[PDB]
Amino acid sequence: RYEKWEKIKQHYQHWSDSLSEEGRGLLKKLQIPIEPKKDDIIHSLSQEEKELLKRIQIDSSDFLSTEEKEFLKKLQIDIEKEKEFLKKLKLDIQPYDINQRLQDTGGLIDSPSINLDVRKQYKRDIQNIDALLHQSIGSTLYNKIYLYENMNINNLTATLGADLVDSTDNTKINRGIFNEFKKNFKYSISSNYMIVDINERPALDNERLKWRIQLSPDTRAGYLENGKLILQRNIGLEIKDVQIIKQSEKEYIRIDAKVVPKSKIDTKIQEAQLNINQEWNKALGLPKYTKLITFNVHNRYASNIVESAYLILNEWKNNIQSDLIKKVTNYLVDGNGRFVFTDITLPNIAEQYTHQDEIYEQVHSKGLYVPESRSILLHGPSKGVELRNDSEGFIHEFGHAVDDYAGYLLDKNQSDLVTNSKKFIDIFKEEGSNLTSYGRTNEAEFFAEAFRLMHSTDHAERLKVQKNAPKTFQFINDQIKFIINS
Ligand SMILES: Cc1cc(S(=O)(=O)N(Cc2cccnc2)[C@H](C)C(=O)NO)ccc1F
Ligand SMILES: [Zn+2]
């Protein structure tokens, strides 16, 4: 367990000694992100904002992560309509987390999804760390050691992660879900600095993935003491093996991976993008030069993001009538619209942030539709709230596109969503709470939810829309009729 520490340490002896006080402080910053302290958030608040914050019920919020919820509760401890307030405040409670910024952006750190000042600080730190990690592990040690990293399955796929652990016995891995996770896991990208161990360490709470990694001779790294290494960012990983193993009467998933040039992985992704486009331009009868599908892939479940795109579009094509699909998609293409499949957060997708300067209006979620760029965005790793799979999410987003085109058809000059018409507003006011809880949010979301359920494989769901929201059901069919006759 400790026999290999010394020789790795001695290899990086001079590197460690020559570290400046700032270089060291930077490595500590990377290991321990800086949380915002409560008292400064509070004193920054005005006394009209303070009074507002404590009267706010907070677990109710739809767009705040459980850590963000808990934090603001502790602010209430010390002290809808104004979602306005929680969206602005959400930005000022993010920890300074270098590795998380790199992962969220996939290395596209110029993405205007955080404030300018911190955005520029992130750049400076990243460039400084890149300069620190100059010494490769080398030929004397690369094949003499293994590097280990424990990982939460939710980091790769939160959808499969919900059922990965056997519900009848939590010491076991669900064999069926295991196969799904392993099936299309061929390669992997690290856009941030992997922090790995020289020897294997016991997994912490809900960590069931245990990586075993072999570096290449040229792979640059730094020693972080206590038998721990930090790897250079932007490295490719080839998955050599995925197996279920048992440690201390508990089942884990071993992932054997080998470091390769990231460019080698990027080449496969680019080849896959050409293939899926040529294949789907033909199926949809689009012009042969159309670029519709785009892979924005930069993270550790890389190969599955690509492979699942094929299946998502297949389910999409299978569950929606052909003529509706063709009409709407050709509308999207006429405005250079894209189907974006990605494993970076959606505010870092150009098809969103280009048309959304306000960060507090920027949205991260499983799926999104942006009318200004006529694009559908689908985020792999995450799990949509009250959503079975990615295909159902994509169908929902396509509902928004249907909404867009239908409204465009009735006035191309003053182009607007059909759900913004007084006609559907009245329908939403009457039937808006008769479907999903989230459908209640607004006209567009109610429309897209209704559209999703009307095209669900569960025929019972389709009948529940016609029975509980017959006016919305009728309205949508009228838009479909309007579209295919256009
Ligand atoms: C139910 C379903 C959900 C999604 S979502 O989670 O990504 N989402 C809705 C959402 C997000 C957070 C909590 N509650 C609902 C985003 C924002 C959206 O509407 N996309 O256009 C996407 C598609 C769906 F069908
Ligand atoms: Zn939506």
Swiss-Prot record:
Record-annotated active site: E397 (proton acceptor)
Activity regulation behaviour: Inhibited by NSC-12155 (1,3-Bis(2-methyl-4-aminoquinoline-6-yl)ure). Inhibited by phenoxyacetic acid bearing alpha-benzyl substituents on the C2-side chain. Inhibited by sulfonamide hydroxamate with benzylic additions at the sulfonamide nitrogen. Also inhibited by sulfonamide hydroxamates with alkylation at the sulfonamide nitrogen. Inhibited by hydroxamic acid inhibitors.
Subunit comment: Interacts (via ATLF domain 1) with the cleaved form of protective antigen (PA-63) anthrax toxin; interaction is required for LF translocation into the host cytoplasm. Interacts with PA-63 homooligomers (either homoheptamers or homooctamers): three molecules of LF bind the PA-63 homoheptamer to form the PA(7)LF(3) complex, in which the relative position of the N-terminal alpha-helices in the three LFs determines which factor is translocated first.
Single GO BP term: proteolysis
Task of the protein: Lethal factor (LF), which constitutes one of the three proteins composing the anthrax toxin, is able to trigger rapid cell death in macrophages. Acts as a protease that cleaves the N-terminal of most dual specificity mitogen-activated protein kinase kinases (MAPKKs or MAP2Ks) (except for MAP2K5): cleavage invariably occurs within the N-terminal proline-rich region preceding the kinase domain, thus disrupting a sequence involved in directing specific protein-protein interactions necessary for the assembly of signaling complexes.
GO molecular function terms attached to this record: metalloendopeptidase activity; metallopeptidase activity; toxin activity; zinc ion binding
Full protein stretch here: 300 to 809 of 809
Gene: lef
Protein name: Lethal factor
Region of interest: IV: 262-486
Location in or out of the cell: Secreted; Host cytoplasm, Host cytosol
Region (5 X approximate repeats): 16-93
Enzyme class: hydrolase
Chain residue ranges for the region called IIA: 1-31
Induction text: Positively transcriptionally regulated by AtxA, which, in turn, is induced by bicarbonate and high temperatures (37 degrees Celsius).
Catalysed reactions listed for this entry: Preferred amino acids around the cleavage site can be denoted BBBBxHx-|-H, in which B denotes Arg or Lys, H denotes a hydrophobic amino acid, and x is any amino acid. The only known protein substrates are mitogen-activated protein (MAP) kinase kinases
Residue positions binding Zn(2+): H396, H400, Y438, E445
Record keyword S-adenosyl-L-methionine present: no
The keyword Signal appears for this protein: yes
Species per Swiss-Prot/TrEMBL record: Bacillus anthracis
Region (III): 37-93
Record family assignment: Belongs to the peptidase M34 family.
Chain positions of Sequence repeats: 16-34, 43-58, 61-79, 80-93
EC number, as in UniProt: 3.4.24.83
Domain of life, source organism: Bacteria
